[PDB]
Amino acid sequence: WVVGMGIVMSLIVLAIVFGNVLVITAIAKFERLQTVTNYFITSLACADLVMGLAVVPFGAAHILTKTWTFGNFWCEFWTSIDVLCVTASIETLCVIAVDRYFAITSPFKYQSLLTKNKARVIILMVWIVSGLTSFLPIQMHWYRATHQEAINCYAEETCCDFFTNQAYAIASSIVSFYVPLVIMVFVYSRVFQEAKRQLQKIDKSEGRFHEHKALKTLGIIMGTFTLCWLPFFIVNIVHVIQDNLIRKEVYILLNWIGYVNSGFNPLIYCRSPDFRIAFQEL
Amino acid sequence: QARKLVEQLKMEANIDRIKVSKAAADLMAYCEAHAKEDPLLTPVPASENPFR
Amino acid sequence: QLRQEAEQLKNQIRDARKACADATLSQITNNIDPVGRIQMRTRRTLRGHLAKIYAMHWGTDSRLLVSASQDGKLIIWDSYTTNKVHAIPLRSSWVMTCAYAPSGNYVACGGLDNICSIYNLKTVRVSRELAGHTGYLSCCRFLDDNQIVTSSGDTTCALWDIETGQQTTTFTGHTGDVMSLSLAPDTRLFVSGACDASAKLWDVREGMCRQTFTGHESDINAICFFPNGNAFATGSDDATCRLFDLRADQELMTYSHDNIICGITSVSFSKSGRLLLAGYDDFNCNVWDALKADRAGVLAGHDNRVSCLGVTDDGMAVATGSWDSFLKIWN
Amino acid sequence: QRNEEKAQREANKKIEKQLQKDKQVYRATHRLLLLGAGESGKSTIVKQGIFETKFQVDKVNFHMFDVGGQRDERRKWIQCFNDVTAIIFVVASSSYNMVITNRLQEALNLFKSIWNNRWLRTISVILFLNKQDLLAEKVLAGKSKIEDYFPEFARYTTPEDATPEPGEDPRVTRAKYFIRDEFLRISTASGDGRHYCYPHFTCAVDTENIRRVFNDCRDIIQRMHLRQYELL
Numbered sequence: 072w073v074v075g076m077g078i079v080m081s082l083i084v085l086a087i088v089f090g091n092v093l094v095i096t097a098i099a100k101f102e103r104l105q106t107v108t109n110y111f112i113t114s115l116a117c118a119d120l121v122m123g124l125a126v127v128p129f130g131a132a133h134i135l136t137k138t139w140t141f142g143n144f145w146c147e148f149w150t151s152i153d154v155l156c157v158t159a160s161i162e163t164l165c166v167i168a169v170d171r172y173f174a175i176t177s178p179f180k181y182q183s184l185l186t187k188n189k190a191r192v193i194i195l196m197v198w199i200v201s202g203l204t205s206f207l208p209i210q211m212h213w214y215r216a217t218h219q220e221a222i223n224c225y226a227e228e229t230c231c232d233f234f235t236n237q238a239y240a241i242a243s244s245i246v247s248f249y250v251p252l253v254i255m256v257f258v259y260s261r262v263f264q265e266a267k268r269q270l271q272k273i274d275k276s277e278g279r280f281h282e283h284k285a286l287k288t289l290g291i292i293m294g295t296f297t298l299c300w301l302p303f304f305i306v307n308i309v310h311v312i313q314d315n316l317i318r319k320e321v322y323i324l325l326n327w328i329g330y331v332n333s334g335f336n337p338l339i340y341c342r343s344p345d346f347r348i349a350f351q352e353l
Numbered sequence: 354q355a356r357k358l359v360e361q362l363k364m365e366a367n368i369d370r371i372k373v374s375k376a377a378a379d380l381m382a383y384c385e386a387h388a389k390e391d392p393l394l395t396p397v398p399a400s401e402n403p404f405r
Numbered sequence: 406q407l408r409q410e411a412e413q414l415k416n417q418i419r420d421a422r423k424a425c426a427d428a429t430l431s432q433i434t435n436n437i438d439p440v441g442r443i444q445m446r447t448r449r450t451l452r453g454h455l456a457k458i459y460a461m462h463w464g465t466d467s468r469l470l471v472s473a474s475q476d477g478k479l480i481i482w483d484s485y486t487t488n489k490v491h492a493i494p495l496r497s498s499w500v501m502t503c504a505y506a507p508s509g510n511y512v513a514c515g516g517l518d519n520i521c522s523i524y525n526l527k528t529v530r531v532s533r534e535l536a537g538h539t540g541y542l543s544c545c546r547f548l549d550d551n552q553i554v555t556s557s558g559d560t561t562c563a564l565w566d567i568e569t570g571q572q573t574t575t576f577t578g579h580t581g582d583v584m585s586l587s588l589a590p591d592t593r594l595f596v597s598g599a600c601d602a603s604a605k606l607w608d609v610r611e612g613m614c615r616q617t618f619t620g621h622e623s624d625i626n627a628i629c630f631f632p633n634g635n636a637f638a639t640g641s642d643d644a645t646c647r648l649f650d651l652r653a654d655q656e657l658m659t660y661s662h663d664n665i666i667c668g669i670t671s672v673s674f675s676k677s678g679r680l681l682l683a684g685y686d687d688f689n690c691n692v693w694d695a696l697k698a699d700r701a702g703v704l705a706g707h708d709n710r711v712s713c714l715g716v717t718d719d720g721m722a723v724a725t726g727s728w729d730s731f732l733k734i735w736n
Numbered sequence: 737q738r739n740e741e742k743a744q745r746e747a748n749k750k751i752e753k754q755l756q757k758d759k760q761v762y763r764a765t766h767r768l769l770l771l772g773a774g775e776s777g778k779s780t781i782v783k784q785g786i787f788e789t790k791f792q793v794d795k796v797n798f799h800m801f802d803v804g805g806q807r808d809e810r811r812k813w814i815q816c817f818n819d820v821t822a823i824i825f826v827v828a829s830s831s832y833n834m835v836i837t838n839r840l841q842e843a844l845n846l847f848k849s850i851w852n853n854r855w856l857r858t859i860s861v862i863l864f865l866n867k868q869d870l871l872a873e874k875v876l877a878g879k880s881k882i883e884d885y886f887p888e889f890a891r892y893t894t895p896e897d898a899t900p901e902p903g904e905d906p907r908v909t910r911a912k913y914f915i916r917d918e919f920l921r922i923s924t925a926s927g928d929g930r931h932y933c934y935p936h937f938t939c940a941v942d943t944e945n946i947r948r949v950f951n952d953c954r955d956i957i958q959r960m961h962l963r964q965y966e967l968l
């Protein structure tokens with residue numbers, strides 16, 4: 072099964088890198104895609120590219136070989152990069168949702184509200200907050216667990232596992248997942264309301280002469296993200312709250328299901344006439 | 354308006370025109386004579402190119 | 406009676422030029438070796454306009470040029486170092502043409518306000534305002550430092566006196582909107598292409614039409630003399646370009662292809678007159694061979710349709726403008 | 737040489753700084769084009785070469801263009817207005833009997849020509865059906881029937897989902913909705929969702945036309961964004 076599992080993990084790495092690099096080059100090489108909305112997309116693409124280039128290969132090697140060979144410092148570096156890449160990718164979807172909300176609900180003030188300098192400031196702030204919750208509490212050993220198994224894991228040199236406290240497992244989970252989820256829900260309810268309200272008016276005025284699309288689009292957008300990231304962030308809290316109820320394999324399986332989400336963003340946020348001709352040109 | 358249109362046609366009709374062969378030969382000779390000056394036909398060296 | 410005589414006179418003109426067609430231009434130039442393949446690359450890109458660009462004119466020194474845009478600006482560039490020199494805001498935001506004086510001290514402008522404005526570069530403020538046209542201006546060219554010729558949408562052209570602001574002479578005879586004009590190298594005759602699919606040759610000194618050419622079948626958009634001065638080329642919105650000879654009083658060759666269906670916006674010649682550059686509505690330019698009528702190059706670096714085109718006096722570079730608010734220099 | 741190069745860069749920076757201030761004003765202004773049928777009473781609408789006017793409602797800047805210097809049946813200049821927010825079309829609805837092909841047919845032909853254009857393929861139209869009191873006065877009296885000029889009116893019935901006013905005689909409502917449907921069918925015949933038409937009934941004593949323009953522009957922009965984001 073090692074050859075079978077090794078083949079599948081190799082294919083996932085190729086899919087993540089191929090899709091993200093293609094999006095980055097398309098925006099940079101062409102002057103018609105230099106838009107404020109595309110800055111969030113390129114930030115998301117950079118985050119997913121770094122994630123799929125760094126986190127996945129070493130994790131696959133660790134799973135296949137069943138041991139850690141890079142020492143006790145590179146394991147902590149890898150964990151920090153993992154948390155940093157996961158946190159900064161989810162928080163950009165929130166920014167995209169808020170951008171669309173401001174574009175649709177308030178059309179007259181949209182140009183004044185969003186400016187390239189403001190977009191750059193927002194992106195830098197998001198990345199800074201993402202970096203403050205991954206490297207700082209991990210490299211300072213503030214997330215360390217206290218039981219005997221945890222200290223035995225920490226004192227070794229070939230074992231690289233994950234053990235954490237209640238406070239960190241709750242705060243990091245909240246910051247990474249729970250606030251963006253409710254913000255996105257609140258945004259995408261109002262967007263759907265406005266869409267269906269506009270549809271009623273067109274068919275009052277000109278119904279006899281001549282909401283599936285919006286429902287399908289919102290369903291896809293919310294469903295992929297939720298179905299990818301919800302079970303992991305549920306078991307993250309649950310296994311800390313109640314001990315010996317979740318095995319060490321369910322955690323890894325759900326975490327990898329979440330990792331897979333990085334390969335779907337180009338298929339969701341990069342379907343437009345301006346992108347499908349840029350891809351053909353390349 | 355009818356009288357003015359007819360008068361213009363009569364004035365324009367009475368002109369002397371040469372055959373097409375002479376005009377084609379003249380254009381071909383001019384193009385052949387001034388061919389070396391044209392920088393767009395043959396690219397100039399980058400030393401003498403102000404845009405490169 | 407009066408109408409009957411016009412039809413009889415038309416046949417005499419047609420029969421007069423039918424006997425002169427001894428041979429065709431393409432038949433004579435069959436033995437000439439083809440020019441080959443011509444490839445050009447972008448050297449500079451000029452940015453700063455907030456809206457689409459309609460007009461552009463090179464300077465006599467082949468270093469500076471002027472451009473116009475719908476946002477209400479008239480920017481003078483430095484093509485070598487890519488530095489903005491001036492930025493003149495316009496009273497009216499609807500502009501259709503601009504010109505650059507041979508001496509380099511003045512710039513003209515006009516559009517939908519039926520007025521031509523002259524600016525003093527070396528003094529920038531408005532110097533004169535010319536009024537009297539009853540239709541939108543389409544083109545304007547500087548004869549000298551004290552006189553200028555303009556064409557408008559009231560089917561007439563005029564020659565102005567800048568010092569007094571009065572029309573010296575008026576040219577009449579077209580039936581549709583006049584779209585463009587071009588001056589002779591010696592500045593004694595000029596040609597105009599109008600919307601009735603006809604072109605005319607005028608006399609500046611006297612003020613009378615000399616010859617009429619009616620080979621097209623749609624609105625003529627652009628016109629330009631051959632460098633010799635005994636021929637000119639036109640471009641209409643039926644995807645065809647034609648070459649007319651003044652002395653033979655008839656057209657000599659047509660430039661068209663079966664894969665082109667869009668209109669033509671601008672035409673220009675090269676330094677020697679061997680190449681013919683024409684802009685199209687399909688977002689890119691094409692390069693032709695004047696003596697053979699076959700394609701030799703394509704310039705496809707513009708996102709939107711190309712609206713203007715020009716070639717330097719020394720023939721070192723080609724400048725194009727388009728509706729994506731960008732200018733490009735091709736060498 | 738060395739000093740000349742620095743001098744040019746100094747003036748370029750000052751100019752490029754000025755262009756940033758002009759871009760903020762340019763992007764916050766909405767441009768409108770005003771058209772008419774020739775005797776449609778569009779001067780009263782604006783009262784209450786090219787002529788330009790400026791007005792602001794709810795801290796939003798509008799700027800409308802009226803063309804009177806060019807009068808021809810071939811509008812070559814109309815390709816310039818391919819970036820405006822909307823086009824305002826004013827037509828006199830009470831001129832069915834007037835011949836000086838009646839004037840309504842000429843207005844309909846002009847609307848059809850404007851709608852199916854290669855350049856105005858993504859631009860909405862705000863339609864004002866002016867002179868309603870005159871239409872009602874002419875309709876109520878006899879000897880003047882739309883049937884004698886529009887044969888299709890012989891088999892028309894007032895729509896069930898109509899909005900008649902409080903005191904209208906039901907005769908005038910049928911004529912008004914027939915006239916509106918004449919434009920609406922042309923609008924919907926070749927429409928693919930890229931642009932729409934917003935018809936209104938306008939009189940001489942009306943004062944809420946600016947509110948109608950504001951709301952129609954808001955709807956235009958919102959529908960554009962919704963279609964762009966694949967939600968409509």
Ligand SMILES: Nc1nc2c(ncn2[C@@H]2O[C@H](COP(=O)(O)OP(=O)(O)OP(=O)(O)O)[C@@H](O)[C@H]2O)c(=O)[nH]1
Binds near residue numbers: 781939
């Ligand atoms: N009862 C009534 N009379 C109107 C109405 N609109 C215009 N009129 C009359 O028609 C005349 C035309 O006025 P204008 O609006 O200046 O007409 P105009 O300037 O020639 O309009 P255009 O030529 O189309 O630009 C006015 O003097 C009014 O008396 C209307 O809505 N109701």
Ligand SMILES: CN[C@@H]1CCc2c(ccc(O)c2O)[C@H]1O
Binds near residue numbers: 150153157244326
């Ligand atoms: C080792 N895997 C980690 C474990 C905990 C964690 C992850 C991602 C985001 C967070 O906010 C977390 O707290 C996972 O990627």
